[PDB]
Amino acid sequence: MNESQIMETIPFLHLRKKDEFGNW
Amino acid sequence: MKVETIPFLHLRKKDEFGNWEYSKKLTGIYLDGLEAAARSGLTFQGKHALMTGAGAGSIGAEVLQGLLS
Structure with missing residues (x-):
């Protein structure tokens, strides 16, 4: 909902x- | 390394x-x-605008009167 306040690899x-x- | 809500x-x-x-x-x-x-309202003085779909009793219809004011 609000990533902005709170905060190996991806296959190819x-x-x-x-x-x-x-x-x- | 508090409750909150989203503004509708x-x-x-x-x-x-x-x-x-x-x-x-x-x-x-x-x-x-x-x-x-x-x-205190909102003016559109001097603005030019094109509107399609401003049929009678539609969203466009209202927005129209808006800019017209």
Whole structure:
């Protein structure tokens, strides 16, 4: 909801899934 | 290394990873004018605007009267 206040690797080839907040 | 809420009406900004995340900075600067409007109003003097879809009884219809005032 607010990443701004709060705050190895990624494949090259990866799948994704959707968040409650439709995010891949 | 406090309860908070989201403003029903907020702007956003894009992350490095093109994400539209809630930006209080903007949501503020907007909502502020949005309030300033409800108070002392808001002028469009001198402005020219084109509007399509301003049918009778539509959102456009209202926005029209807006700019017309």
